[PDB]
Amino acid sequence: SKGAELFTGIVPILIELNGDVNGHKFSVSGEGEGDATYGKLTLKFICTTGKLPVPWPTLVTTLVQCFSRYPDHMKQHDFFKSAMPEGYIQERTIFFEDDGNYKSRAEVKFEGDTLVNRIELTGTDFKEDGNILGNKMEYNYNAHNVYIMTDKAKNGIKVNFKIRHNIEDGSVQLADHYQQNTPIGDGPVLLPDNHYLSTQSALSKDPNEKRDHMIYFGFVTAAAITHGMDELYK
Amino acid sequence: SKGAELFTGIVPILIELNGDVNGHKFSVSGEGEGDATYGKLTLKFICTTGKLPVPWPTLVTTLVQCFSRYPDHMKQHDFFKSAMPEGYIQERTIFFEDDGNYKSRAEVKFEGDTLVNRIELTGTDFKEDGNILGNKMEYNYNAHNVYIMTDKAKNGIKVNFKIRHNIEDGSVQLADHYQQNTPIGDGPVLLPDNHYLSTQSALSKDPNEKRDHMIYFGFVTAAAITHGMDELYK
Incomplete structure (x- = not known):
């Protein structure tokens, strides 16, 4: 795509999140750069309202998949870059096991030379004693496979x-x-x-x-599917 | 410790490994740098014998924990740096679930200005079409907690x-x-x-x-224990 041409170098990134989880209102600002040729992101985030009322790890997915590396034989499947520079809307519901859920809507697009991710997030139905409002998560993150399919009705x-x-x-x-x-x-x-x-x-x-x-x-990095989204226990 | 003073900046790293798994031999050479102040490592490894006969992920732990960040309040617990520059011997047995095992012996020490990890590894009892010799592992890695205790008898x-x-x-x-x-x-x-x-x-x-x-x-980064090394199932 023509959009992908915008990602051949190092691209500056700006991220802004406004959040409200169970009535706890917070804000996060982030900045860094993306290197789609190698599939690398480097980002620093600050809670501008003071102490984050939820665990940092719970916000990682919410806080720019246009920076993924698509190998040459897969360039035809890079929706994210193809939508640039005008951008795309990214919406999620995230269900936390035995606890509440986040809902997010973000606009990801170029503003000048900077890729900007602007997010509204709402969380509800959380337990005050749970891992989120109780801040019982370790500060770390694992590897995940993120599964993408066409949604023809939405051209997305x-x-x-x-x-x-x-x-x-x-x-x-x-x-x-x-x-x-x-x-x-x-x-x-x-x-x-x-x-x-x-x-x-x-x-x-x-x-x-x-x-x-x-x-x-x-x-x-984008890859061909070899298994389902859930863990196989055998 | 005095050895900790050697890690206050960016330190160059060299790694050399010879391995033999079920009679399949390989050598791996690695270089990069460590930044213990932040707990960061960056390393590139090449197989110098052509094709690696096992998955790269199986060699990650074998291929310099002296580069861990120990917070100030924990600096009295940093064995790895205290052994420097003379270095330490690191030995492992690694049991792969329903498959074979690796055994390794390494020396980690300063050679000139460079922190060097030299290793010999032997693997046995692997299944020829298991995940290791059959090379069925995804190319990724997760977060883990590495549990350390004193071993008085060995001064280690x-x-x-x-x-x-x-x-x-x-x-x-x-x-x-x-x-x-x-x-x-x-x-x-x-x-x-x-x-x-x-x-x-x-x-x-x-x-x-x-x-x-x-x-x-x-x-x-080093931290105080809050749970056991195995996953708790709820």
């Missing part, structure tokens, strides 16, 4: 995956993601074959940063 | 953890790690309280690199 895509959140008691809590993306513009987009994004992450800190923050490193 | 430490390897059929295979480290020198070392290293990783590729290879990114 539907995306599904489960995130595994490691909890401080040794358990793991799944966050079931239902995602949809639609072009903002009227130009042509690439409607992809069913495939997935191999996504790997690490959350870090700057020990000299006193503000509540998250340093996020992402590594993402 | 014992280390235990389980690695979760994502398999191409959607299953997960555990690799049970039994590890021991002993100092080479007879200078004083720090024998730590029982604690763990929060370890996060990502495996990437250089699309233009034609040799069989792995780009490894590591992110490691």
Whole structure:
């Protein structure tokens, strides 16, 4: 696509999230850069309202898949870049196992030379004693496969995956993601074959940063599906 | 410790491995740098004997924990740096669930200005069409907690953890790690309280690199234990 031409170099990124989870109102700002040729993201996030009232890991998926590396033989399936620079709407519902849910709507598009992700997020039905409002999640992240299919009715895509959140008691809590993306513009987009994004992450800190923050490193490459979205127990 | 002063900046790293798994031999060479102040590692590995006969993910733990970030309040528990520059011996047995095992012996120490990890590895009892010799592992890595305790008899430490390897059929295979480290020198070392290293990783590729290879990114910070090394099922 022509959109993909915008991603051949290092692209500056800006992220803004306004959030309200169970009446706890917070804001996050983020900045960094993307390197789609290698599938790399480097982002720093600050909670501008003080202490984040939820765990940083719960916001990782919400806080720019246009920066995934699509191998040459898969370039025809890169919806995300094809929708640029006008952008796409990315909407999710995320169900936290035995707890509440997040709903998000984001606009991802170029504003000048910067790729900008602007998000509204609402969370409801959380337990005050749960892993989210109780802030019982470890500060870490795992590898996930993110499954993408065409959604023809919307000239876009539907995306599904489960995130595994490691909890401080040794358990793991799944966050079931239902995602949809639609072009903002009227130009042509690439409607992809069913495939997935191999996504790997690490959350870090700057020990000299006193503000509540998250340093996020992402590594993402598109690949052909070899199994289903859920874990096979055999 | 005094050895910790050697890690306050960016340190160059060289890694050399010879392995023999079920009679299939390989050598791997690696280089990059570590930044213990932030707990970051960046390393590129090449197979110098052509095609690697096992999955890259199986070699990740074998292929420098002295680069972990120990927070100030935990610096009295950092055995790895305290053994430097003379270094330490790191030995492991790794049991792959329903398959064979790796045994390794490595020396980690300063050679000139460079931190070097030299390893010999032997693997046995592998199934020729299991996930290792059959090469059925996804190219990715997850977050793990690495549990450390003092081993008084050896003036060293014992280390235990389980690695979760994502398999191409959607299953997960555990690799049970039994590890021991002993100092080479007879200078004083720090024998730590029982604690763990929060370890996060990502495996990437250089699309233009034609040799069989792995780009490894590591992110490691020490922390107080809050649960056991196995997953708690609720």
